[PDB]
């Protein structure tokens, strides 16, 4: 389709790429537009299998609730809100890091990197531990990106997750999707690390935006859709293993995100 040629900017994610692709292709019409938008969303997720992309596409198409003048104006403002959501999340989350603390991360995440950069701009000293992310090497690239921030970093293997757990002070990771009950959907090496953190009583923090809220209610690891897992690339984390969630709608408890999901009408 066209999402591939907007991948020229590595800073932006795949879901926002699909959102802006839909916005650009919206002004090509020559009601029945709902079917066209649904087919466009389906073609968009047919290339990349991500829950975040589908949730963002649904939330974008949700603004429906010639007469096309009103419809077009919403896309640019929506994109601006997603753009400012990252800064808002970073501002809300940078206050939870103290001097000399140890931070454990799983893989590459632009939100976590922005939060860390805000914390470093707040004149704080900390160390970061990143899992090597064996399936696709992204933890080492995250460490390389953090290297020029003058932040001490160290990459560890995904096998050595419970070995350095006692040396960490808090755990913050991103999320590819927030389910209705309160859990998160992330990389494969997330649930076991959360379990280890819970066993060691270490805090578990999740940072995600408001366009990743999906309406799913899994009960185990096999309840997630098969199209999203594809060696699986995605798992499910129980809401009881998450301490706090930092979004653009404010700090929310795992038991409080359900009300936000319902009010979002997604």
């Amino acid at each position: 389709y066209f999402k591939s040629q907007m991948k020229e900017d590595p800073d932006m994610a795949s879901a926002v790429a699909a959102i802006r692709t839909l916005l650009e292709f919206l002004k090509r019409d020559k009601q029945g537009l709902r079917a066209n938008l649904t087919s466009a969303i389906e073609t968009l997720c047919g290339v990349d299998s991500s829950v975040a992309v589908s949730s963002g596409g649904e939330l974008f198409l949700r603004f429906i609730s010639k007469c096309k003048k009103i419809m077009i104006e919403r896309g640019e403002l929506f994109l601006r809100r997603i753009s400012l959501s990252r800064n808002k999340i970073a501002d809300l989350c940078h206050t939870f890091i103290k001097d000399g603390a140890t931070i454990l991360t799983h893989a590459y995440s632009r939100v976590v990197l922005r939060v860390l950069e805000a914390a470093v701009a707040a004149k704080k000293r900390f160390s970061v531990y990143v899992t090597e992310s064996q399936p696709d090497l992204s933890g080492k690239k995250m460490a390389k990106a953090l290297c020029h921030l003058n932040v001490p970093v160290t990459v560890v293997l995904d096998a050595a997750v419970g070995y350095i757990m006692e040396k960490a002070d808090l755990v913050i990771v991103g999320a590819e999707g927030v389910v209705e009950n309160g859990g998160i959907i992330n990389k494969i090496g997330t649930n076991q690390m959360a379990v280890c953190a819970k066993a060691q009583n270490k805090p578990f923090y999740v940072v995600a935006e408001s366009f990743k809220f999906v309406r799913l209610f899994p009960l185990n690891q096999q309840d997630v859709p098969d199209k999203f897992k594809y060696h699986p690339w995605v798992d499910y984390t129980a809401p009881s293993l998450i301490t706090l969630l930092f979004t653009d709608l404010g700090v929310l408890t795992p038991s409080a995100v359900s009300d936000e999901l319902i009010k979002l009408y997604l």
Binding site: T95, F96, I97, K98, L244, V251, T253, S255, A256, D259
Partner: protein, 318 residues
């Protein structure tokens, strides 16, 4: 004129240099009175400058003593009332002051009624031949026990705090009404476990995630209750709801002189010994069972819902 400013600096000084009213209800009442007087005898032609002035005064009061989250709640409630009145009227500039005064008076009446509303629900959660444990001195738990003991008979164990032995006064006050109380130190808390049927305690404030700030030694009591699977019910009015989540908060506890812990007459060893005397502590929300207030018992997971009505989200930072 100058009288309002003089009362403002007097309140700020009496908040900063030392403690104020013994009871939190009186502190909230006088904070509301100060806010009403500030609103009354001031020059403001629009709502925006009034909210800015109220926010500045609230910030000054918070900076005077950040350990107590009582004045800030009143400032946030007043700001929410101002916003609600502005939305009702504009959505004006003539009858705003009278509506504000009426809202303040009804809020004061409700605050006065919270005590009776909380005390009225004593018989439901307390039965005969039960063991109840309290730590420190609290005016709400005392009223709860005294109202529940006028129709039934149970056993109460009171443990005093090591630095400030305020539990002795609570034990004496209870035993003056025939409750058959017991006095013991904080060391024998795990030993007294496995025989207590219910735990009723108070708190200084309630955080956003359902956590609360109480006197020292409450964390050990909560841990023991969780280990022995005993229920833990906390009685606190609606003005103790703090809209701030638990941050790093290196100054969360109040640190006082080490005289209470270690006497000054120890000798030359005081020059190389570090003594710390924290007052408050942090209790995780997972160790609490029920939250009793003036509108009925609620789960710890209803704290955010209860807070959303009380305070506007933009006033969380004040």
């Amino acid at each position: 004129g100058s009288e309002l400013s003089e009362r403002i600096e007097s309140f700020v000084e009496t908040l900063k240099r030392g403690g104020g009213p013994r009871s939190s209800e009186e502190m909230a009442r006088e904070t509301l009175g100060l806010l009403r007087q500030i609103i009354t005898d001031h020059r403001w032609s629009n709502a925006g400058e009034l909210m800015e002035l109220i926010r500045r005064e609230g910030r000054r009061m918070t900076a005077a003593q950040p350990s107590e989250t009582t004045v800030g709640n009143m400032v946030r409630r007043v700001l929410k009332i101002i916003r609600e009145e502005y939305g009702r009227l504009h959505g004006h500039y003539a009858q705003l002051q009278s509506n504000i005064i009426e809202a303040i008076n009804e809020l004061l009446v409700e605050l006065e009624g919270t005590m009776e509303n909380i005390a009225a629900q004593a018989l439901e959660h307390i039965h005969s031949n039960e063991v109840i444990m309290t730590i420190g001195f609290s005016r709400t738990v005392e009223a709860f026990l005294k109202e529940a003991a006028r129709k039934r008979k149970f056993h109460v164990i009171v443990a005093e705090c090591a630095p400030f032995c305020q539990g002795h006064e609570m034990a004496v006050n209870l035993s003056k009404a025939g409750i058959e109380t017991t006095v013991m130190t904080d060391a024998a808390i795990f030993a007294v476990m496995s025989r207590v049927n219910k735990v009723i305690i108070g708190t200084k404030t309630i955080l956003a995630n359902g956590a609360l700030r109480a006197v020292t030694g409450t964390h050990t009591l909560a841990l023991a209750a969780k280990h022995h699977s005993t229920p833990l019910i906390v009685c606190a009015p609606m003005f103790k709801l703090s809209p701030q989540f638990p941050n790093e908060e290196d100054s969360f506890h109040k640190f006082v002189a080490p005289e209470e812990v270690l006497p000054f007459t120890e000798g030359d060893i005081l020059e190389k010994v570090s003594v710390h005397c924290p007052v408050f502590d942090y209790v995780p929300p997972e160790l609490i069972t029920l939250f009793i207030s003036n509108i009925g018992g609620n789960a710890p997971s209803y704290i955010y819902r209860l807070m959303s009505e009380l305070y506007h989200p933009d006033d969380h930072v004040l």
